[PDB]
């Protein structure tokens, strides 16, 4: 269940993988892990299936409500704070989840929220069984300057090395990009493969 979310200049990328495990067993080689939760916001579930999904819905619904009646997206921080609160209000009967809230309001943000409700903003954040790897690559390949496309590559180079050690992550590599201009925009499968083949990976 490897996912990540990096910031940049007027942009935010969020890429996951899509495998659902159960020990030395693989139920689905293709599930969903990256969703658009609002016009300029995304989210990456990671951990317990059920909980995660229920959250996404509990979310997508609430962001939309606000947006529909207030005519303005909700600040990326208030979104993480909302999620924060929800998770802590029942920290003793938690959600075996771990999500990432990324998007752009006035600036490109990225939040990592835990089963406790503690949400902390950072430059990049990798949630998932194979994140220690993504955190390995990134601590030796990420740079604030990077181009909108250099980013989409970096993210991939990570989840692609992660998929090389984390028995729990696999499948395709869904990626998306939030630009103040184009808003949330998921990349086409083919386009992702293009990136792959060039680097030198297989799957």
């Amino acid at each position: 269940t490897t996912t990540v979310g990096i910031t940049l200049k007027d942009a935010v990328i969020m890429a996951t993988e899509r495998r659902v495990t159960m020990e030395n067993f693989i139920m689905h080689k293709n599930g969903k892990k990256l969703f658009q939760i609002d016009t300029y916001t995304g989210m990456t579930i990671a951990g317990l299936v059920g909980d995660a999904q229920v959250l996404v819905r509990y979310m997508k619904a609430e962001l939309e409500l606000y947006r529909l009646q207030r005519r303005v997206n909700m600040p990326i921080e208030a979104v993480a704070t909302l999620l924060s609160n929800m998770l802590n209000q029942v920290k003793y009967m938690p959600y075996m989840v771990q999500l990432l809230v990324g998007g752009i309001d006035t600036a490109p943000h990225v939040f990592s929220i835990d089963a406790a409700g503690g949400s902390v903003e950072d430059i990049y954040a990798s949630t998932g069984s194979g994140s220690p790897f993504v955190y390995g690559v990134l601590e030796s390949q990420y740079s604030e300057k990077m181009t909108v496309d250099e980013g989409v590559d970096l993210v991939i180079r990570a989840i692609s090395a992660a998929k090389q050690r984390d028995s729990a992550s696999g499948g395709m590599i869904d990626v998306a990009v939030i630009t103040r201009k184009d808003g949330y925009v998921q990349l086409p499968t083919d386009q992702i493969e293009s990136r792959i083949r060039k680097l030198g990976l297989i799957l």
């Binding site: 819905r57 619904a61 609430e62 409500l65 529909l68």
Partner: protein, 227 residues
């Protein structure tokens, strides 16, 4: 001497209170909508007021969801209130099923709510009437929810001091599947013919949706066209 409580039937078997609220609705400015070739539309009269009022907050038309929207007519207080329930109910519906599948149970939730208030003492019904319209797994949708919880799906209908006159028209002029722009004007005419001699139909708001597309509110200039 019966028309005093929401729970007392008259000797004829009428609930005068409930009626009286269908009367409060009749004091609200006209508004209709009709489905056509892939989608529906909504038109609402609005007698322009104080330029000190931010136009954003005087639109009898509201986007409940991206693919559904409604319009009210009656007590303004109860207006806002109900609107929210719609928006809110929308969500719950949307989250327990993954998507607002049938626009119907959105209108059910609202109808059931409004109905209740017309059966218990200590409460008073909503003096509002709502017309819902949008796109669901089925397609173009149009319902009209009255104060008593009564809901009916139309192809074209209206609410407000006009209603009768506006339906009198459509009920003898409306012809389904019209290409948006054509259906737009027909309703414009219908709406027009509900005013009183001398009155000049000012700029009325209008919005539409079409199979596979989100709603859209005609801006005051794209509207100033059918004038």
């Amino acid at each position: 001497a019966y028309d005093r409580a929401i729970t007392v039937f008259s000797p004829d078997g009428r609930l005068f209170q409930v009626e009286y609220a269908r009367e409060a609705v009749k004091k609200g400015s006209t508004a209709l909508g009709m489905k056509f070739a892939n989608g529906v539309l909504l038109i609402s009269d609005k007698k322009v007021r104080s330029r000190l009022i931010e136009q954003n907050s005087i639109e009898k038309i509201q986007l409940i969801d991206d693919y559904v929207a409604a319009v009210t007519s009656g007590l303004v207080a109860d207006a806002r209130v109900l609107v929210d329930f719609a928006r809110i109910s929308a969500q719950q519906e949307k989250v327990t099923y993954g998507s607002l599948v049938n626009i119907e149970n959105l209108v059910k939730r609202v109808a059931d709510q409004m109905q209740q208030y017309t059966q218990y003492g200590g409460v008073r019904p909503y003096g509002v009437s709502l017309i819902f319209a949008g796109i669901d797994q089925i397609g173009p949708r149009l319902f009209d929810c009255d104060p008593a919880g009564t809901i009916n799906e139309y192809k074209a209908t209206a609410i407000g001091s006009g209603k009768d006159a506006v339906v009198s028209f459509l009920e003898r002029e409306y012809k389904e599947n019209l290409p948006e722009k054509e259906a737009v004007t027909l309703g414009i005419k219908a709406l027009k013919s509900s005013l009183e001699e001398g009155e000049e139909l000012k700029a009325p708001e209008i919005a539409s949706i079409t199979v596979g597309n989100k709603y859209r509110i005609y801006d005051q200039e794209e509207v100033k066209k059918f004038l």
